[PDB]
Amino acid sequence: MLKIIIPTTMLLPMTWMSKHNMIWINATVHSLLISLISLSLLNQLGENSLNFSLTFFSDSLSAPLLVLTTWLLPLMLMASQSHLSKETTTRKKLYITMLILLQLFLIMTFTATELILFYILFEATLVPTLIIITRWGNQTERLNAGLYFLFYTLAGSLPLLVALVYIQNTTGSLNFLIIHYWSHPLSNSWSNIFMWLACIMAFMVKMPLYGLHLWLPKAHVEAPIAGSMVLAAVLLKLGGYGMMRITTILNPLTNYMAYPFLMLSMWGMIMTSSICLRQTDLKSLIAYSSVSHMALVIVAIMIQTPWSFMGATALMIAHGLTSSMLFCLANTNYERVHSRTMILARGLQTLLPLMATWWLVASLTNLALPPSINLIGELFIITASFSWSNITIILMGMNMMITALYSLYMLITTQRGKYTHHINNIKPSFTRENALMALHILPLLLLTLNPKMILGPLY
Amino acid sequence: SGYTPDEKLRLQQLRELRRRWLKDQELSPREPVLPPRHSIFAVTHVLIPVWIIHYYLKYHVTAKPYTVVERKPRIFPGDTILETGEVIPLMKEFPDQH
Amino acid sequence: SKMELPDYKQWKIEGTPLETVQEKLAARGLRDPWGRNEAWRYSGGFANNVSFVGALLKGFKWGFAAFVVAVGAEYYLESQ
Amino acid sequence: AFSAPAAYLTHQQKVLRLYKRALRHLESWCVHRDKYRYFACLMRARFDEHKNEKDMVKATQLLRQAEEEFWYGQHPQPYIFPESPGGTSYERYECYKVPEWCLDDWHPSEKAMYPDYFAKREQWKRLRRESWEREVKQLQEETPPGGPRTEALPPARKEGDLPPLWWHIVTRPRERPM
Amino acid sequence: MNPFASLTLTTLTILTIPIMMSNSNIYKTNLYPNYVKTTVSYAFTLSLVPLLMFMH
Amino acid sequence: SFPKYKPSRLATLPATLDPAEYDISPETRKAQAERLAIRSRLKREYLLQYNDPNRLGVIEDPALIRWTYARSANIYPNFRPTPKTSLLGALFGIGPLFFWYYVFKTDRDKKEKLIQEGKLDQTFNISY
Amino acid sequence: GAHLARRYLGDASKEPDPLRMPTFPPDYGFPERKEREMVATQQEMNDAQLMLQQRDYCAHYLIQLLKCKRDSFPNFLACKHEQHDWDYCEHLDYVKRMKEFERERRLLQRKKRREQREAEMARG
Amino acid sequence: SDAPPLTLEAIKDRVLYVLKLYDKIDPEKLSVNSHFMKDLGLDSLDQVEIIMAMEDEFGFEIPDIDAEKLMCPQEIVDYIADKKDVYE
Amino acid sequence: LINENNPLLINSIKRLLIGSIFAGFIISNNIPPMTVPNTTMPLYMKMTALIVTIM
Amino acid sequence: VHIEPRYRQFPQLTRSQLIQAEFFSATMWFWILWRFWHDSDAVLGHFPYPDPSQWTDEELGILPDDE
């Protein structure tokens, strides 16, 4: 695993010793090479995980996450070099350093064998994100949003630490292999109930769970393009990965303690999907769609069936790619009109044909059009929930009906109709934007041919 | 009732300008200055795809069991089998209500 | 192209239902000043039109003739 | 569409609009031309029966009763011209209308073709540029100090002058742009 | 191998060929609609054969 | 004389059928003139910027910013905890949760009770 | 249907119920009923792949029709006599069903009338 | 293909042809500059019918606010030319 | 502006015309019997569609 | 082919369109007549509907109300 960790660290001196007009090129090229190297982790086994050493290991659940994390950095660099043109060289290098540190922390987090090191890196991921949001954001809200991002997470994650150090005092270890092999059932007591709550809410805040989701429409909207991209694509999947890892010790209490969270998620799907229908802000619409998608992953993890686990992993990967592409598409129009209002700029299909095509493909993948992996994950989760309870099909289908409603609506208001008359500064799309769109969308379609690579360890 | 003199005059000026602009939307004879077999359709669009599909089905798809499953051929009395040479007996002396 | 309008004086309501309309207003005390403008809808090839049953049996004569000759040929050929 | 609206419609305007609307719905009900002519002459007589009524109270009451009659007897599916707001080809070609300023973003290679058109476009752009200040001055002189009472715009009252705010009216793309 | 399966699969696969040519220099010419119509006609003619085998 | 047309929320009253357009007083005409004056002044202000050759960008509309700010950022400062607001929030945010909890808990208890007695016909139920 | 009018409007207990029919023993009035004969046994019907609906007492004619259709494929207007024979067999089966319906109707009408007459003869 | 490129002369001929059909207007006294009220003595309800006749003739609808202002055949011809983007 | 004398339209409509004339007879006679026909029907019920249509 | 608008006159027609329309109408009518003459049973039926009242009580096994 050090064969990917060390080049990521080496990206820092390379960026800091590069010329004032060569940082972007070197960073993009070497991040792409690192992603190519990380692609080798997809060769997973069928029985046990890839135990590289005492510190790091790779499983069929974390390999696609690592690949997506490594692939995301070149896209962030491509998207971030437009609005940072007037910036000074030192601040550009600081921004690239923040991105590289975030990627390094994410790679270390997705492969830590011990739960305490996983928690340490999972909490360390907050500093670069908060710095990016509160320093390179555009509006005055970027301060407040940062606080909302900083304290929602910690208030959930601080009890988890108290739980983790407690577990090692009773079982003797926090290594995931020993934890799994020496797993014991959880009794139904108040102490065990609060231990269950401590280990779960830290990740429920990150997903986020409906009710603890208010930080997301602020943080994602107020952050710059790369910040929102990394927040939606990867940072939201930390909660799902941690829940998948930690739910082993919570059995069989998860049978009884999952009811409030399942109810919250299944009603929050409908609630957020309906909220997306009336949204004057496009970026907020995408952010709320992200929560509506993550509620499904929460339900899938809670019901605890192999089909649900595979569907949740596939949905996580697909949603990360789709949300990143949608945020890029929104930022493309924002960089022209300098406003996030969805009805301000209309009829863009007449002026930007290929970007309209990109919008159409992103919207099609957003509403889970088969045979896209979004549909695979959603359908696996829905089938597992139907096995859990048939009445679930009432809500899930409803969500689907709403999901297509607010997606094509977003496609119709911005792309169709007649162009607004007074706007006359719409320039043709640059090759950088189209290349970013293509690099977002091509792997999404390519993953359909080999879905087993993103179906998790239950496959 | 009717146009006011100023309204009418402004209409004439706008009409003249619009007519001139529409006349200006016309192209010169040189205007698009561009810068510097009998049955070949059926062989590259039918023959090639059918060759590829026949090869793929005969030598790759059929190499695995149950990949290509056929409905059992219908057998009627008096028929002859090509595999074993068996003959099926006739259908039991019709009452012949003719 | 290079085709001009016909004479405006040829449009008469004579022989058309517009005449029945003109008498029906005249019996009430009013006049129809736009009758001539519609006259072209009854003037040329629009003067006569087929009925519904006539429309349904558009090609009955030729098809019936073909049917009878075919039947007569086949019946007499069958008597070998 | 082209004329500036007024503060209100007078009685004459309202009754004329009602007459036209009732005639259109009558034509929708009376499909054939002779029957429509008969009943349209009858409707014209019915309107003319109160042509010279001078008491405005009774006139307004009759107009109200006629409006109720029209609303009760209107065609549920009246005929609409295809390009009219309710028609089947209302905004059909709005997707093919492209604003002229997009031509400013064309590549030099694209502008290599149609050189005469772009020379004429440069002529038009300079003509627009050289007359803007005069138009602004004329608008600032003619308008009352409080502000415009009506959206009507003035013509060019000098010789080498263009009517103020003319560029977007004159440079309309087309009704059949492609 | 009997030609039923091959002909049935070819009927569907030859419809996708003009889609593969949507970026070629036939999509920017005015002969594309006629090309698609000819492809559909050829597909119908090919599909007529498995139908004959079934009726047999 | 004719069946009267009564308006509704989703089918409003027509412009020809409202009494307000048939009972006219001079202050009504004055109000209409003032409305026209405001509309015309706004139209002239927009058209001065729209037709300008030097302008490049977007004509910023204060009304749109006001609409967005009222819909998003001005709601909490104008919120007061009132019996109507409290009851509506409690209902619309609490009732669905316990309703669905009761429904699913009842269904799952029924299913588990059927399973324990061994009467569900779970044959061929391999995948779950 | 007329039977529907008689049943739904008149006395419903005088005419058969299609779901519950026949209710009388098959040998109640007939002195000797012979078993209905079938030509094609189970094996030929299974080989011919006839549908479960088509496997009725007219299956042999259907088998002959299918055989002659398969043999004379290009000229599809030769299977007229065989189709006629199969259709005649189906028509005869339908008339048999109608005969059964009429028999049950008359037997049901006779039974209740006979018992009511016996009761009337027991009035005093 | 589609309809021919209708021009100014065509529109003027159609308008005068429709007007000459009308019984009320004398064909000889009618001219392209003839005002509907002063020169021919028609009322407002009659101008509405003339506007409707032109609407039917050219197959498009003129708004009432625009319709009321038209009082000469030349005015109607110019309005139709502006609507149809006819420059000859 | 009535003008239908274009070979594309005429051929396209004519092909489906021949289809809608002869396809029922062609197809009905080559498919094998998929059901049991209704051989015995009352005369007033065999003709019910036709009188309903003409009425 | 090149025909022109005619402005309130019957539009110009060509021989081929009239002959094709007449030919196809006659073909349809001949098909109907031919099929009626050869396949009448498809419309008029082939087997008569038996009348249940014409069946004797012995044909349906009915005892004469005494046994």
Ligand SMILES: CCCCCCCCCCCCCCCCC[C@@H](O)O[C@H](CO[C@H](O)CCCCCCCCCCCCCCC)COP(=O)(O)OCC[N+](C)(C)C
């Ligand atoms: C906006 C969204 C925020 C996130 C929401 C998080 C959801 C957390 C909910 C936790 C799930 C249940 C917690 C405790 C389990 C049982 C709860 C209770 O209602 O059940 C009864 C518990 O009995 C009594 O009701 C005790 C609970 C009474 C006191 C709790 C206060 C409830 C008020 C609601 C609090 C709001 C939650 C969020 C706070 C911010 C069962 O009866 P009993 O058989 O005897 O107990 C079984 C447990 N044993 C075996 C250990 C003994």
Ligand SMILES: CCCCCCCC/C=C\CCCCCCCC(=O)O[C@H](COC(=O)CCCCCCC/C=C/CCCCCCCC)COP(=O)(O)OCCN
């Ligand atoms: C963004 C907001 C998210 C908020 C998340 C925070 C809620 C987490 C749940 C409460 C955390 C407390 C658990 C801490 C670790 C417990 C591990 C454990 O098992 O120890 C228990 C101790 O359990 C406790 O003491 C927990 C009591 C709670 C103290 C803190 C109260 C915080 C609020 C509690 C109720 C609310 C919880 C859910 C709220 C949802 C958030 C809105 C037993 O230890 P022993 O000494 O060995 O006893 C057995 C031998 N005799």
Ligand SMILES: CCCCCCCCCCCC(=O)SCCNC(=O)CCNC(=O)[C@H](O)C(C)(C)COP(=O)(O)O
């Ligand atoms: C299908 C249809 C449904 C039913 C439709 C119902 C329609 C009801 C018809 C009855 C209408 C009336 O009573 S008519 C309305 C009754 N009130 C008056 O007539 C007031 C006096 N109006 C004038 O004097 C005008 O000037 C004028 C006469 C226009 C001359 O104007 P011109 O100077 O320009 O010629």
